[PDB]
Design a protein around this ligand. Structure first.
Ligand code: ZN
Length: 474
């Protein structure tokens, strides 16, 4: 059987990255006319041609003979899959042909059946245009990506920022300094140098505008950014320097913002939370109970605080620790609001039928500062909902890492936990609440057009992270 032998030998070439050998077998199949060409033969060759772009000894062969393999695949009556289109997009981008790398994807997305065009399909085009300082054709790829419903990562956004800085398009540079802020957060060392080069450059110091109305724009957006135009005269003062624990940069000596988590994104969180919670008993009775009587500054994971530093074997529970968390949050509250504790019905009873505790537990149920979550369903979803919907603190020592709560948007979560979650500790006797930080680690604009960029300390992120401060002085 010749078809199985060709597929077996082409795979043996792909294991060694031996393009020369597989590309010889490709000729033997065509000229002899003994073997039936098929999708898996064409695919194996195209991936190998894309794989060989990095190899110096095999790149010239892949670029010369790669497109003929793709053209034979289409004319044989086989539509090209996502990986095959990406392979030719990379091959075309390797020899500076951005327009073919673009239009090979436009044909693919135009079918729209089972295409599924990933970012790696469009990236060969986009990067090739930004390499050749073709800003206009670069931005076309972004439009066709964003319309096709594909997220841009840091590398693509940095490429578009780079080409904007090269062509001197100060409108577009401002666009992508907010795309990084929005879709990335803290930036790379390479990405930081792309930004540093702009603000140090002469074009950046030829832009300007007001004071009063921008304050509303900062508040309405969240706190991080005002989001329209540059502010100042010229000559930026770029410098790297660390930030305080209180949210105060040592370079410029101004206040960093603690940005509110996205209001529309928080509504997607709570709806997906109620959707999973409504699953066999009535969850909706808590929803209205919170809304009717619930204006607390903090929520407490009752099961966590009580079982903290207790033996899993003994089944020992600690109301005294849960009592301490109640009193300290009440003190730290300015208006003096007691937090809402959320325990199970199995844990509230047994606490209630202990005569020592009964009074204190009954007191909290009467005052509306403790809610019993019903059996069967988890308490997990009740205190997530309570803190998230009311937008307040959540006291628990539990970084929620699991595949049951996998609908957690890990982009939105962590970013939510850093703003809202309160950790704690009981050193022998006394309690110590570890509050969330008074400033967020994200890109942000001041009212005076002063930017701040945090660089991602990938190894050991701490208070000694370097921030790249950029201000005007006017
Ligand atoms: Zn600063």
């Amino acid at each position: 059987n010749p078809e199985t032998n060709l597929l077996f030998n082409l795979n043996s070439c792909s294991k060694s990255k031996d393009l020369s050998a597989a590309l010889a077998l490709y000729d033997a199949a065509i000229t002899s006319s003994e073997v039936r060409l098929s999708q898996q033969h064409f695919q194996t060759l195209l991936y190998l041609c894309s794989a060989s772009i990095t190899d110096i000894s095999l790149q010239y062969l892949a670029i010369d003979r790669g497109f003929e393999i793709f053209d034979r695949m289409v004319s044989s009556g086989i539509s090209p899959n996502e990986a095959s289109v990406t392979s030719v997009a990379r091959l075309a981008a390797a020899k500076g042909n951005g327009d073919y790398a673009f239009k090979v994807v436009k044909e693919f997305v135009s079918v729209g059946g089972v295409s599924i065009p990933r970012l790696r399909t469009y990236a060969p085009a986009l990067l090739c245009f930004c390499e050749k300082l073709e800003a206009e054709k670069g931005y076309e790829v972004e439009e066709h990506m964003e319309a096709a419903g594909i997220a841009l990562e840091e590398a693509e956004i940095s490429a578009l920022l780079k080409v904007s800085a090269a062509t001197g398009r100060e409108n577009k540079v401002y666009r992508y300094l907010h795309k990084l802020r929005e879709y990335v957060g803290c930036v790379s060392e390479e990405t930081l140098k792309i930004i540093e080069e702009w603000f140090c450059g002469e074009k950046a110091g030829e832009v300007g505008d007001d004071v009063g109305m921008l304050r509303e724009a900062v508040l309405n957006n969240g706190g991080g950014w005002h989001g329209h135009g540059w502010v100042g005269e010229g000559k930026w003062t770029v410098k790297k320097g660390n930030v305080s624990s209180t949210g105060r940069c040592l370079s410029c000596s101004e206040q960093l913002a603690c940005v509110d988590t996205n209001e529309v994104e928080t509504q997607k969180f709570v709806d997906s939370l109620v959707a999973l919670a409504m699953d066999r008993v009535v969850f909706s009775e808590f929803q209205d109970w919170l809304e009717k009587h619930g204006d607390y500054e903090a929520i407490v994971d009752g099961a966590n605080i009580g079982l903290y530093q207790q033996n899993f074997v003994d089944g020992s529970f600690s109301l005294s620790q849960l009592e301490s968390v109640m009193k300290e949050l009440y003190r730290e509250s300015g208006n003096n609001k007691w937090p809402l504790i959320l325990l199970h019905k199995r844990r509230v009873k047994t606490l209630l039928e202990n005569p020592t505790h009964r009074n204190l537990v009954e007191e909290w149920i009467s005052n509306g500062v403790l809610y019993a979550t019903p059996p069967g369903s988890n308490d997990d979803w009740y205190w997530l909902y309570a803190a998230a919907k009311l937008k307040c603190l959540l006291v628990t020592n539990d970084e929620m890492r699991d595949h049951i709560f996998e609908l957690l948007g890990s982009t939105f979560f962590q970013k939510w936990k850093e703003r809202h979650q309160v950790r704690y500790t009981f050193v022998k006797g006394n309690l110590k609440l570890e509050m969330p930080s008074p400033f967020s680690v994200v890109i942000q604009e001041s009212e005076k057009g002063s930017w701040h960029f945090p660089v991602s300390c990938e190894n050991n992120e701490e208070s000694s992270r370097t921030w790249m401060c950029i201000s005007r002085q006017s």
